[PDB]
């Protein structure tokens, strides 16, 4: 039975190939005591977060703390899935443009620390494309730590045309803390950030027309919503509901010069071969938790329509389970009979070394 593990900057999604949903979802963190176990992993750190210093081993989609990542994987196999890794082929995920040395190290750790019988490393955006049933299209994957626009042709990501945006869900939570603080409610601490993440996920949305929506917010209180904190205390949120994810379209809101996600989509397509551009426009797939904002697909449709040739068929696909589409795509892929020839086997690793990840994945 094959395993699928999507290693997020924010959340680990893990489970078995062939299942519709990840069996286990837990925070990508390792925590250590602030004052006199030596460490706590994932949900175990979450449950004791108040007394621990938290560290994220994955930054902007790239593994940067290998010792802590090994703890994450150990916890995934033994605590979460309750499996013996030497008994299961394992599919891992990686960010677009993940350095070769990173993927070699991942491969080495899997074969040599966990003794997996076989493994494979797949690109997150590609798995989401597959989950939607396509092998050609352009994927916008906005997660907790990074946002990528990834044009894909017949299963192949087109590296020259990939766009990376270091603006994603965590930055948006931080921005919401800031503007709620300006509103009159102080959100400044580490625990308060989690509260504001929940507010963001509950109440934020993307305006179809930002200027019009701001006008409405100023003219009446119908866009206002109350939010009850865990202790019963209540706050109100007004135009911050849509100003927060507006940052995706206007990165200058947090002082970045970068183009917004609509422009990065357009720029990405325009870097691709002329004959595949219309196929990308017709197959724009959203993925990741930060694409969950109500209104986002219609706003993307609008902005891209304005940028594209006026007769271009534009289509935005935003699947309901797109928080987990990377994992779901991996589940589908690993369970295809036609995929069984793709795995990197232990025998193949032993004779070739970690560099075999370049040839097989």
């Amino acid at each position: 039975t094959a395993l699928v593990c999507d290693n997020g900057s924010g959340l680990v999604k893990a489970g078995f190939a062939g299942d519709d949903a990840p069996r286990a979802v837990f925070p990508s963190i390792v925590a250590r005591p602030r004052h006199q176990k030596d460490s706590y992993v994932g949900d175990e750190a979450q449950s004791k977060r108040g007394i621990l210093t938290l560290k994220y081993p994955i930054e902007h989609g790239i593994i940067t703390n290998w010792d802590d990542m090994e703890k994450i994987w150990h916890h995934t196999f033994y605590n979460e899935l309750r499996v013996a890794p030497e008994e299961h082929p394992t599919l891992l995920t990686e960010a677009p443009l993940n350095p070769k040395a990173n993927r070699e190290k991942m491969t080495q750790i899997m074969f040599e620390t966990f003794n997996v019988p076989a493994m494979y490393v797949a690109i997150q955006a590609v798995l989401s494309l597959y989950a939607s049933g396509r092998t050609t299209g352009i994927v916008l994957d906005s997660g907790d730590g990074v946002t990528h626009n990834v044009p894909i042709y017949e299963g192949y990501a087109l590296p020259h045309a990939i766009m990376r945006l270091d603006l994603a869900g965590r930055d948006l939570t931080d921005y919401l803390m800031k503007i709620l603080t300006e509103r009159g409610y102080s959100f400044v601490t580490t625990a308060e950030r989690e509260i504001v993440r929940d507010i963001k996920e509950k109440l934020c949305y993307v305006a179809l027309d930002f200027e019009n929506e701001m006008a409405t917010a100023a003219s009446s209180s119908s866009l206002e919503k109350s939010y009850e904190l865990p202790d019963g205390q209540v706050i109100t949120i007004g135009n911050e509901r849509f100003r927060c994810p507006e940052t995706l379209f206007q990165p200058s809101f947090i002082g970045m010069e970068s183009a917004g996600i609509h422009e990065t989509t357009y720029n990405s397509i325009m870097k691709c071969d002329i004959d595949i551009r219309k196929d990308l426009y017709a197959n724009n797939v959203m993925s990741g938790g930060t694409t969950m904002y109500p209104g986002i697909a219609d706003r993307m449709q609008k902005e891209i329509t304005a940028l594209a040739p006026s007769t271009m068929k534009i289509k935005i696909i935003a699947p309901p389970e797109r928080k987990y589409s990377v994992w779901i795509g991996g589940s589908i892929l690993a369970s295809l009979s036609t995929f069984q020839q793709m795995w990197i086997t232990k025998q193949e690793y032993d004779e070739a070394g970690p560099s075999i990840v370049h040839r097989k994945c």
Binding site: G133, E154, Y156, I332, T338
Partner: peptide, 24 residues
């Protein structure tokens, strides 16, 4: 599921892709 498998089975090679200028 059935839909994805076919396109994956007919997935052209890294070489055959460079030929059409699509893949570097």
């Amino acid at each position: 599921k059935d839909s994805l498998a076919i396109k994956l089975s007919n997935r052209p090679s890294k070489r055959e892709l460079e030929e059409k200028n699509i893949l570097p």
